[PDB]
């Protein structure tokens, strides 16, 4: 069979008090001439950690059959056995895992979505239109309308400030400005305690929001389950979880209507697929967090209509762009992820290492 | 209001006297373990107080731990050293996308341990007394350098030697393809040492459910202190089923890297003896949470590795614990653990009572520091 002969990893600081995002890129090449590209990231601390671990375990891939992806995921995990099956170690593993899936799809001359098997050619999308809790409503409404004009399918508004009546008034304003035909979601970013979340969720019910995201602390599964059980409005959460096991807990507690796994954060496509499988089984919906260039493919393979958020943050890393039209994000049709590194990455790369022969 | 003013971290690669080669090595799927990467943390305050802490990685993970610790370290400067759990949370939040387990929290654990060391010293108490102890000595055991592939006669001699020097029990590695072989080996050790020497076995996750069922059943009449890691570290339902059926205590947990994971073991009643590793779970703070959950569930404790730290933690547990004696980390420190009549003496010096040995500098590959002393 084929075998991995070369691997290169690099830490790229993408310029945007978040001033930059640390990206970990993984490049894998095989004796058969096949190639794959993958990545993971860290918004805050963690970039140097992911890279250092990735650099130490990369050699374990040399000589292995690229097609046995899950097997390799497990092998690299064992390479750092005392490091755990979550967190920084598996996120570093994720960059390689994504590269291998990219490579396999390309081997089949198919987009990642088609390799996995698709249910749709485009996915519903939304954005925050640069909106923040401190953004004047007037400014946000304008930016939101511009997004709808450009094809976005929904708007997610930040909420969770001490004065809840203010958030309610802000959402009412956007609803009036955009009309009942524009879907809206709110993200409390874990800012409410249980009683407040109960009161805020009850007030939002008549608004018919698509979902209320992270009303509680990321690990308060029982709290989230209680909210979901009681309210019609879907509860969304999961972006902070870093393993299939943590998502498994959410599902077991029925703490989320919309699961929000982040492939890079949970250790790559392999663990993401196991989470998606558990979610499908449990009858849940999917709303992947961040990294649309990767999640658009993963969402396309989910059986029930998902939502993917449009972000411009990572665009500069790649030559290709995502296309949006009429409230939906088009699933790329190029082989694999359909991504190649922009020449600009050269300037932002702070660390790099390679092993094997090309 | 004291404040942290200086922090120093270093990555020390400790050479091992003898390489560790498990089944994976013998089957040619991995290299023998010949060193351990230690992450050392030193914290100093305006009030002049000092603390030393550490974490470690057996296989890959050292560079990652150090790298992360270096990036979050400055977040300690200016903070009150006494608010330990608060600071644990703060550093965790500084790398919130990294999760609450694994490499990130193991890096945090090195600082956490230094803070506890510093608080104990501030009170002029050993860590054990700071927490409150239930005993001045803890039952101990060792492997006597025995491995699955060590000649039985040699293992028995070394084991007799350990007992002679005061060790209180012997843990034997089992789990090879041919189970009858493991049985005969335990039988020989039992015969060589006598009925009065406690014995435990470690399968190191090598059995599948049906095999574990059969081996545990054969081992019942041996009255072992415990059968450790008979299954995969995450097969909670399998461990619980074994524990429920057999009298012999089931021990596991050394591979877990967070309070939440140990919480899962306890919830499933997957272990009679919980084996948390403070460094691996994120330090003393998470360890204490685990111990409280364990005490409440009525379980027993058998901390994994790092005796220099776990001797203090075991002393603070209500029910009689077991701590394993290892000589691996000794070269790193000037102090030594005392063993007598089957128990290891809880150190009485302030804090953890550890000071870096002169040999540590030479083994230091990476280091950094922030703030001024
Ligand atoms: O859902 C989201 O994208 C937010 O919840 C972000 O992940 C958040 O951490 C932060 O990056 C932001 O943009 O407010
Ligand atoms: O219980 C133990 O100490 C063993 O299970 C070790 O942790 C093991 O990983 C290995 O280091 C060994 O000593 O065989
Ligand atoms: Mg969010
Ligand atoms: Mg509901
Ligand atoms: Mg063990
Ligand atoms: Mg039992």
Q: Where are the domains of chain B?
A: 1-124+358-373, 125-357
The angle that helices B103-122 and A47-57 make with each other, rounded to 10 degrees, is 120
Task: Give Cβ neighbours of residue B122 (< 8 Å, ≥ 6 apart).
Answer: B49
To the nearest 10°, the Cα dihedral for A252, A258, A263, A268? Answer: 40
Strand A235-237 and strand A212-213: pairing?
A: parallel
- Look at the block and give the residue holding tokens 């406690």: B198
Question: Residue A329 and residue A126: Cα distance in Å, rounded?
Answer: 9
- Beta-bridge partners for A124: A307, A328
DSSP letter at A200 equals H
Ligand 2 touching residue B202 (CB < 6 A): yes
**HSE-CB for B239 with a 13 A CA cutoff:** 31
Helix, strand, or coil (residue A127): strand
Is the Cβ of B104 closer than 8 Å to some Cβ of chain A? yes
Q: Which residues of B are less than 8 Å from A90 in CB distance?
A: 102
**HSE-CB for B74 with a 13 A CA cutoff:** 4
Output the CA–CA distances (angstroms, integers) from residue B1 to A224, B74, B79, B123, B372, in the order listed: 38, 19, 9, 15, 18
Q: Is A282 exposed, middle or buried (0-12, 13-18, 19+ CB in 10 A)?
A: middle
DSSP letter at A212 equals E
Question: Residue A276 and residue B46: Cα distance in Å, rounded?
Answer: 51
Interface-testing mutation among A45, A63, A242, A351, with chain B (most B C-beta atoms within 10 A): A45
Task: Give Cβ neighbours of residue B63 (< 8 Å, ≥ 6 apart).
Answer: A52, A53, A55, A56, B11, B37, B366
Q: Which ligand is nearest to the CA of A235?
A: 4
Question: How many angstroms from the chain centroid is the CA of residue B289?
Answer: 16
Angle at the Cα of A19 (from A18 to A21), degrees rounded to 5?
A: 80
Output the CA–CA distances (angstroms, integers) from residue A18 to A42, A143, B45, in the order listed: 11, 21, 29
- Look at the block and give the residue holding tokens 């690099």: A10
Single out the residue of A290, A282, A288 nearest to residue A300, CA to CA.
Answer: A288
What CATH number should be reported for the domain whose range is A110-342?
A: 3.20.20.120
- Beta-bridge partners for A26: A9, A38
Contact between chains at A86 and B68 (C-beta distance less than 8 A)? no
Backbone angles phi, psi at B339, to 5 degrees: -115, 135
Question: Residue A84 and residue B158: Cα distance in Å, rounded?
Answer: 33
- Please answer whether residues A91 and A85 qualify as being in contact, where contact means their C-beta atoms are separated by less than 8 angstroms: no
- Beta-bridge partners for B334: none
- Please answer whether residues B355 and B334 qualify as being in contact, where contact means their C-beta atoms are separated by less than 8 angstroms: yes
Contact between chains at A46 and B101 (C-beta distance less than 8 A)? no
Question: How many angstroms from the chain centroid is the CA of residue A63?
Answer: 30
Output the CA–CA distances (angstroms, integers) from residue A106 to A103, A333, A335, A339, B358, in the order listed: 5, 11, 5, 11, 55
Contact between chains at A79 and B97 (C-beta distance less than 8 A)? no
CB atoms within 10 A of CB A134: 7
- Please answer whether residues A211 and A287 qualify as being in contact, where contact means their C-beta atoms are separated by less than 8 angstroms: yes
Output the CA–CA distances (angstroms, integers) from residue A286 to A237, A295, A333, B304, in the order listed: 10, 10, 22, 40
How long is chain A?
A: 358
CB atoms within 10 A of CB A265: 30
* Residue A251, token pair as written in the block: 């599902």
Contact between chains at B98 and A91 (C-beta distance less than 8 A)? yes
Question: Residue A236 and residue A211: Cα distance in Å, rounded?
Answer: 6
* Residue A268, token pair as written in the block: 């790559």
- Beta-bridge partners for B7: B43, B370
- Beta-bridge partners for A155: A127, A184
Q: Which helix (H) or strand (E) holds A141?
A: helix A137-149
Single out the residue of B33, B52, B34, B32 nearest to residue B42, CA to CA.
Answer: B52
Q: Closest residue (by CA) to atom 13 of ligand 1? A: A132
- Look at the block and give the residue holding tokens 């933690």: B313
Task: Give Cβ neighbours of residue A248 (< 8 Å, ≥ 6 apart).
Answer: A275, A278
CB atoms within 10 A of CB A286: 27
- Beta-bridge partners for A329: A123, A324
DSSP letter at A328 equals E
After which residues does chain A have a break in its backbone, defined as C to next N over 2.5 Å? Answer: 16
Instruction: Provide the number of CB pairs (under 8 Å) joining chain A to chain B.
Output: 136
Question: Residue A211 and residue A198: Cα distance in Å, rounded?
Answer: 14
- Look at the block and give the residue holding tokens 């089984």: A281
Residue B58 CA: which ligand 2 atom is closest?
Answer: 11
- Please answer whether residues B152 and B185 qualify as being in contact, where contact means their C-beta atoms are separated by less than 8 angstroms: yes
Single out the residue of B295, B333, B286, B335 nearest to residue B317, CA to CA.
Answer: B295
Ligand 1 touching residue A262 (CB < 6 A): no
Question: Residue B266 and residue A321: Cα distance in Å, rounded?
Answer: 48
Question: Residue B334 and residue B267: Cα distance in Å, rounded?
Answer: 40
Ligand 2 touching residue B277 (CB < 6 A): no
Single out the residue of B332, B336, B334 nearest to residue B360, CA to CA.
Answer: B332
Ligand 2 touching residue B79 (CB < 6 A): no
CA distance A85 to chain B (A): 7
Distance in Å, CA B202 to ligand 5 centroid: 6
Three-class HEC string of chain B: CCCEEEEEEEEEEEEEEEEECCHHHHCCCCCCEEEEEEEEEEEEECCCCEEEEEEEECCCCHHHHHHHHHHHHHHHCCCCCCCHHHHHHHHHHCCHHHCCCCHHHHHHHHHHHHHHHHHHHHCCCEHHHHHCCCCCEEEEEECCCCCCCCCHHHHHHHHHHHHHCCCCCEEEECCCCCHHHHHHHHHHHHHHHCCCCCEEEECCCCCCHHHHHHHHHHHHHHCCCCEECCCCCCCHHHHHHHHHHCCCCEEECCCCCCHHHHHHHHHHCCCCEECCCHHHHCCHHHHHHHHHHHHHHCCEECCCCCHHHHHHHHHCCCCCCEEECCCCCHHHECCCCCEECCEEECCCCCECCCCECCCHHHHEEEEEEEECC
Contact between chains at A49 and B260 (C-beta distance less than 8 A)? no
Strand B322-324 and strand B4-20: pairing?
A: unpaired
Helix, strand, or coil (residue A29): strand
Measure CA of the first residue to CA of the last residue in chain B; give whole Å.
17
- Please answer whether residues A248 and A278 qualify as being in contact, where contact means their C-beta atoms are separated by less than 8 angstroms: yes
The sign of the dihedral angle between the CA atoms of A237, A243, A247, A249 is negative
The angle that helices A47-57 and A69-79 make with each other, rounded to 10 degrees, is 100
The sign of the dihedral angle between the CA atoms of B15, B18, B22, B25 is positive
- Look at the block and give the residue holding tokens 């560790």: B20
- Beta-bridge partners for A10: A25, A352
- Edge-first strand order for the sheet with A258-259 is A155-158, A184-187, A212-213, A235-237, A258-259, A285-286
Q: Which CATH number fits domain A1-109+343-358: 3.90.1150.10, 3.40.50.150, 3.30.70.20, 3.30.390.10?
A: 3.30.390.10
Ligand 2 touching residue B26 (CB < 6 A): no
* Residue B354, token pair as written in the block: 């550890």
* Residue A133, token pair as written in the block: 């809790």
Question: Residue B236 and residue B255: Cα distance in Å, rounded?
Answer: 13
Contact between chains at B64 and A56 (C-beta distance less than 8 A)? yes
Measure CA of the first residue to CA of the last residue in chain A; give whole Å.
17
* Residue B317, token pair as written in the block: 């547990």
Backbone angles phi, psi at A32, to 5 degrees: -80, 10
CATH architecture of B125-357: Alpha-Beta Barrel (3.20)
- Residue A158 is a catalytic residue: yes
* Residue B138, token pair as written in the block: 């803890």
Question: Residue B156 and residue B161: Cα distance in Å, rounded?
Answer: 9
- Please answer whether residues B289 and B259 qualify as being in contact, where contact means their C-beta atoms are separated by less than 8 angstroms: yes
Q: Closest residue (by CA) to atom 9 of ligand 1? A: A189
Contact between chains at A51 and B67 (C-beta distance less than 8 A)? yes
Is the Cβ of A92 closer than 8 Å to some Cβ of chain B? yes
CA distance B243 to chain A (A): 23
Question: Residue B275 and residue B291: Cα distance in Å, rounded?
Answer: 10
Is the Cβ of B76 closer than 8 Å to some Cβ of chain A? no
Q: Which CATH superfamily is domain B1-124+358-373 in?
A: Enolase-like, N-terminal domain (3.30.390.10)
| Residue A228 known to bind ligand | yes
Output the CA–CA distances (angstroms, integers) from residue A53 to A90, A257, B87, B88, in the order listed: 9, 34, 25, 22
Nearest to B60 among A42, A56, A219 (CB): A56
Strand B227-228 and strand B199-202: pairing?
A: parallel
Contact between chains at B98 and A46 (C-beta distance less than 8 A)? yes
Q: Which helix (H) or strand (E) holds A292?
A: helix A292-300
Q: Closest residue (by CA) to atom 4 of ligand 1? A: A189
| Residue A25 known to bind ligand | no
Question: Residue B162 and residue A250: Cα distance in Å, rounded?
Answer: 48
Angle at the Cα of A173 (from A170 to A176), degrees rounded to 5?
A: 155
Nearest to A49 among B64, B255, B280 (CB): B64
Task: Give Cβ neighbours of residue B339 (< 8 Å, ≥ 6 apart).
Answer: B140, B165, B166, B167, B325, B345
Going through chain A in order, the beta strands assigned E by DSSP cover: 4-15, 20-30, 35-42, 122-126, 155-158, 184-187, 212-213, 235-237, 258-259, 285-286, 307-309, 324-325, 328-330, 349-356
CA distance A289 to chain B (A): 12
Indicate the top mutation candidate among B37, B228, B254 to test ligand 2's pocket, ranked by most ligand atoms within 8 A of CB: B254
Q: Which residues of A are less than 8 Å from B96 in CB distance?
A: 44, 240
Nearest to A52 among B64, B101, B260 (CB): B64
- Which residues in chain B (203-242) have CB-CB distances under 8 A to chain A? 234
Is the Cβ of A130 closer than 8 Å to some Cβ of chain B? no
Question: Residue B184 and residue B182: Cα distance in Å, rounded?
Answer: 6
Helix, strand, or coil (residue A14): strand
Question: Residue A90 and residue A80: Cα distance in Å, rounded?
Answer: 9
Contact between chains at A242 and B98 (C-beta distance less than 8 A)? yes
Q: Which residues of B are less than 8 Å from A84 in CB distance?
A: 101-103, 257-258
Ligand 2 touching residue B254 (CB < 6 A): yes
Q: Find, in chain B, the residue whose alpha carbon is nearest to that of A264.
A: B97
- Beta-bridge partners for A15: A20
Question: Residue A228 and residue B308: Cα distance in Å, rounded?
Answer: 47
Distance in Å, CA A68 to ligand 2 centroid: 29
Nearest to A53 among B30, B72, B103 (CB): B103
Distance in Å, CA B41 to ligand 6 centroid: 40
Question: Residue B170 and residue A253: Cα distance in Å, rounded?
Answer: 42
Distance in Å, CA B240 to ligand 6 centroid: 8
Single out the residue of A216, A261, A227, A225 nearest to residue A243, CA to CA.
Answer: A261
The sign of the dihedral angle between the CA atoms of A94, A99, A104, A110 is positive
């Amino acid at each position: 069979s084929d075998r991995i002969t070369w691997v290169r990893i690099s830490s790229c600081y993408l310029p945007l008090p978040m001033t930059e995002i640390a990206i970990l890129f993984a490049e894998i090449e095989t004796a058969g001439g096949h190639q794959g590209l993958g990545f993971s990231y860290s918004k805050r601390a963690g970039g140097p950690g992911q890279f250092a671990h990735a650099r130490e375990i990369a050699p374990a891939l040399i000589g292995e059959d690229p097609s046995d992806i899950a097997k390799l995921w497990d092998k690299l995990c064992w390479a750092g056995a005392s490091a755990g099956r979550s967190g920084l170690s598996t996120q570093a593993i994720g960059a390689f895992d994504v590269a291998l899936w990219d490579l396999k799809a390309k081997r089949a001359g198919l987009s990642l979505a088609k390799l996995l098997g698709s249910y749709r050619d485009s996915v519903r999308c939304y954005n925050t239109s640069g909106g923040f809790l401190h953004t004047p409503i007037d400014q946000l409404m304008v930016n939101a309308s511009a997004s709808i004009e450009r094809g976005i399918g929904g708007i997610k508004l930040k909420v969770g400030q001490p004065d809840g009546a203010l958030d309610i008034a802000r959402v009412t304003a956007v609803r009036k400005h955009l009309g009942d035909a524009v879907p809206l979601m709110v993200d409390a970013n874990q800012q409410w305690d249980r009683p407040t979340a109960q009161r805020m969720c009850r007030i939002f019910e008549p608004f018919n929001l698509v979902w209320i995201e992270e009303p509680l602390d990321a690990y308060d599964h029982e709290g989230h389950a209680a909210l979901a059980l009681q309210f019609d409005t879907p509860i969304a959460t999961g972006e902070m979880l870093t393993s299939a096991a943590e998502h498994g807990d959410l599902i077991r507690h029925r703490a989320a209507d919309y699961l929000m796994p982040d492939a890079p954060r949970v250790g790559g496509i392999t663990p993401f697929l196991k989470i998606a499988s558990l979610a499908e089984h449990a009858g849940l919906m999917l709303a992947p967090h961040f990294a649309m260039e990767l999640h658009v493919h993963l969402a396309a393979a989910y059986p029930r209509e998902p939502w993917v958020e449009h972000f411009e943050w990572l665009e500069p890393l790649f030559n290709e762009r995502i296309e949006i039209r009429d409230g939906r994000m088009l699933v790329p049709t190029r082989p694999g992820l359909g991504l190649t590194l922009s020449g600009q990455v050269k300037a932002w790369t702070r660390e790099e290492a390679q092993v094997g022969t090309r």
